[PDB]
Amino acid sequence: MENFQKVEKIGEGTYGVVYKARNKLTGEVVALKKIVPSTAIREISLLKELNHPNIVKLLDVIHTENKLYLVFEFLHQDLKKFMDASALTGIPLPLIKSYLFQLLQGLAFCHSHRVLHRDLKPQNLLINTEGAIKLADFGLARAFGVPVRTYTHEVVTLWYRAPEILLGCKYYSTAVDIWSLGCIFAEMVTRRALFPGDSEIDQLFRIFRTLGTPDEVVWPGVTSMPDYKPSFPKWARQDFSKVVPPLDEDGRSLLSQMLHYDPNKRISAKAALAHPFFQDVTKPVPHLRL
Numbered sequence: 001m002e003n004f005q006k007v008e009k010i011g012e013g014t015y016g017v018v019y020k021a022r023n024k025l026t027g028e029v030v031a032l033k034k035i036v037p038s039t040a041i042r043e044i045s046l047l048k049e050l051n052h053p054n055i056v057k058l059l060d061v062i063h064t065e066n067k068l069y070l071v072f073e074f075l076h077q078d079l080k081k082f083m084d085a086s087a088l089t090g091i092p093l094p095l096i097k098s099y100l101f102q103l104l105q106g107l108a109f110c111h112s113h114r115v116l117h118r119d120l121k122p123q124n125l126l127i128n129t130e131g132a133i134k135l136a137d138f139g140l141a142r143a144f145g146v147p148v149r150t151y152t153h154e155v156v157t158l159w160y161r162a163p164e165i166l167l168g169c170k171y172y173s174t175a176v177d178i179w180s181l182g183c184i185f186a187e188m189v190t191r192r193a194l195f196p197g198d199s200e201i202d203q204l205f206r207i208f209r210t211l212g213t214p215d216e217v218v219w220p221g222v223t224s225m226p227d228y229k230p231s232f233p234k235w236a237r238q239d240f241s242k243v244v245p246p247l248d249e250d251g252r253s254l255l256s257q258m259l260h261y262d263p264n265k266r267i268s269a270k271a272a273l274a275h276p277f278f279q280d281v282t283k284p285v286p287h288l289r290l
């Protein structure tokens with residue numbers, strides 16, 4: 001750690017404090033994360049080679065005095081702050097589309113290597129002044145787990161969590177990331193979180209009140225899942241035209257496929273990239289500040 005100089009604290013992550021720092025050897029400005037079991041070291045080391053332009057680069061893994069520090073590429077802004085700053089006006093559709101397209105590319109890459117994120121949320125989608133967006137903290141959930149509360153006791157958000165996770169599936173798939181990204185897409189479009197649950201059951205029932213309570217017709221096997229209750233109320237599904245106006249029919253088609261209940265039906269990142277919604281995709285320059 002003597003090789004790094006802290007510049008400022010830039011947030012409280014799930015596992016520890018995050019600092020902006022300067023690498024004295026390279027001159028590099030980095031994001032330095034305080035998080036060790038040998039299984040975690042090996043998993044994290046595997047992530048050093050999972051490189052893609054839409055994945056925040058893991059520069060180094062430092063294990064010392066029984067401690068783990070992760071050194072990442074630094075980006076100046078997250079999508080949560082950008083959405084808050086764009087609240088009055090909305091993020092322009094071409095930029096939403098560009099961001100979604102880029103995030104799907106990052107997912108298609110990671111998923112092709114059988115690596116999942118499992119905790120996508122606006123705070124770990126990072127943006128630059130060039131129009132890029134990147135997925136941060138990719139793979140850390142499998143290395144370290146997703147806790148109920150962070151190291152500072154902050155509640156880990158449920159808003160983007162896939163229904164199979166909430167229903168107690170132990171062996172979930174890359175589809176969990178598509179669900180999260182669909183929730184984020186909807187949030188960019190409407191300027192409000194899609195399913196802002198404040199407990200597991202509130203999260204589940206919010207999903208059910210929009211998408212309908214799932215049953216064996218739409219999701220074979222759902223009624224046997226560990227946390228499924230036959231006493232769940234039966235809500236009717238809403239039309240997406242109500243849920244995400246003014247999104248056009250290509251966008252609503254894509255979103256609906258990202259939010260399919262049955263993970264085996266849910267669209268893949270690769271298939272989503274071929275969707276007609278991306279016919280006219282471009283890479284605009286965002287209106288930022290710093």
Ligand SMILES: Cc1nc(C)c(-c2ccnc(N)n2)s1
Nearest residue numbers: 011012013031072074075136
């Ligand atoms: C909390 C924070 N979560 C992330 C992902 C942060 C961050 C900020 C800047 N750069 C990087 N890589 N990560 S700060």
